[PDB]
């Protein structure tokens, strides 16, 4: 650290770096995309996926074929691979991979809440939990449809109790609606992640600062555009933005005050690559749209991330890109299942 890396990082994480990049080696190519776009039936899809590292797993199961089996199988391979990667980790990495768990534990606790509001039991919700955020903890059951002991449970077991310590009360829980709540928790979570990353400076900070910055900016823009159709007041919008974006010193309030799409376009047109992103978004019937462009930006930034090797960003980027790959495969199977051929080429070309 302090302009002197490769004194501690490699010494204790060389093997894990080798695994993460070996898994990155199995990423699909454009040749694989060309090979799989000419399947025309799910049997051919598994027969052609036999070639890639997913081979021989699709067999010995699923006599009928459907989107669900491939989706949850890819999810299963994801979770088992990550878990195997994570549970040999050392503490500097343990913080990061705990955060990887938590970023979906947030959605897990979204699922858990509204149980007591509709008087539901845990064991029926447990299957629908996100596998990465299983959390394997006791006293998450027999809640007796009481929100107070639910507050107690989430406090005692979950380390997002740090955010629940101040950002949430019982009043907020049983009056305010789930979506602003999860937005605020995600914001505070990203801020915790950012301050932790800055605490561990060096090349890791250099790699991670742009990803989190764009994440905050994308979240801000998404809430700004979606807040138009709803009755939500502008002060709530101002609250919902994070404190990490480049627009926080100025221009986030400008976005909150703006009530027209052209105004948001003008505000976003004061930073060059964002000008390119927004002008590229014609948003007419026949081109792609804003969130697609954001996806291309995310993957290209992750690509710049793996280009570097002395950092724990290589311990994050593949996760996001692999998720993109899984949903790409799901898209292929969907297009097979609908016989719709004019949107086959609408897949993000990651390698």
């Amino acid at each position: 650290m302090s302009f002197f890396p490769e004194l501690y990082f490699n010494v204790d994480n060389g093997y894990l770096e080798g695994l993460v990049r070996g898994l990155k080696a199995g990423v699909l190519s454009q040749a694989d995309y060309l090979n799989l776009v000419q399947c025309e039936t799910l049997e051919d899809l598994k027969l052609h996926l036999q070639s890639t590292d997913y081979g021989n797993f699709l067999a010995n199961e699923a006599s009928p074929l459907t989107v669900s089996v491939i989706d949850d199988k890819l999810k299963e391979k994801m979770v088992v691979e990550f878990r195997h990667m994570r549970n040999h980790a050392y503490e500097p990495l343990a913080s990061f991979l705990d955060f990887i768990t938590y970023s979906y534990m947030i959605d897990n606790v979204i699922l858990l809440i509204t149980g007591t509001l509709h008087q539901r039991s845990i064991a029926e919700l447990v299957p629908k939990c996100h596998p990465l955020g299983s959390f394997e903890q006791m006293e998450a059951v027999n809640i007796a449809q009481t929100p107070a002991e639910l507050y107690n449970a989430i406090l005692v077991d979950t380390p997002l109790a740090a955010f629940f310590q101040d950002c949430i009360s019982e009043q907020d829980l049983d009056e305010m609606n789930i979506e602003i709540i999860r937005n605020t928790l995600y914001k505070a979570y990203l801020e915790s992640f950012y301050k932790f990353c800055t605490l561990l400076g060096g090349t890791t900070a250099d790699a991670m600062c742009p990803i989190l910055e764009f994440e905050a900016d994308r979240r801000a823009f998404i809430i700004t555009i979606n807040s138009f159709g709803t009755e939500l007041s502008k002060e709530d919008r101002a609250k919902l933005f994070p404190h990490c974006g480049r627009l926080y010193p100025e221009g986030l309030a400008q976005l909150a005050r703006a009530d027209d799409y052209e105004q948001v376009k003008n505000v976003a047109d004061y930073y060059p690559e964002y000008k390119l992103l927004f002008e590229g978004a014609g948003s007419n019937p026949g081109d792609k749209t804003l969130e697609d462009r954001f996806f291309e930006h995310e993957v290209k930034l992750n690509k710049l991330a793996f280009l570097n090797q002395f950092h724990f960003g290589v311990f994050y980027a593949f996760v996001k890109l692999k998720e993109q790959e899984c949903r790409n495969i799901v898209w292929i199977a969907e297009c097979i299942a609908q016989r719709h051929r004019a949107k086959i080429d609408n897949y993000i070309p990651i390698f």
Partner: protein, 99 residues
């Protein structure tokens, strides 16, 4: 009714296609809306209509001014969801008519 049903099949086809598209760009949000059902906004009522001295029923659609999922997925995307909303609303119109 035969002709309307033939149209119904195709409109269901592309409605399902758009549904799958929105599900791709939005992830697995189905359980959310499954668990967040509290109140309807589409309703129906039965009027009478007599031709040649014999009565038959007719169904009509009322658009109650309320919503529950008006802002689901606000921080990730909801425009494809809104396309699904209008598509399925016109689908409900057509289905009630043929019913």
């Amino acid at each position: 009714i035969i002709e309307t049903k033939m149209l119904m099949g195709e409109v269901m086809r592309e409605a399902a296609f758009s549904l799958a598209e929105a599900k791709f760009t939005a992830g697995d949000f189905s359980t959310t809306v499954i668990q967040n059902v509290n109140k309807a906004q589409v309703k129906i009522r039965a009027k009478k209509d007599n031709v040649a001295g014999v009565t038959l029923p007719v169904f009509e659609h009322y658009h109650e001014g309320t919503d529950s999922y008006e802002l689901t997925g606000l921080a990730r995307g909801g425009e494809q969801l809104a396309k699904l909303k209008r598509n399925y609303a016109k689908a409900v119109e057509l289905l009630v008519e043929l019913a």
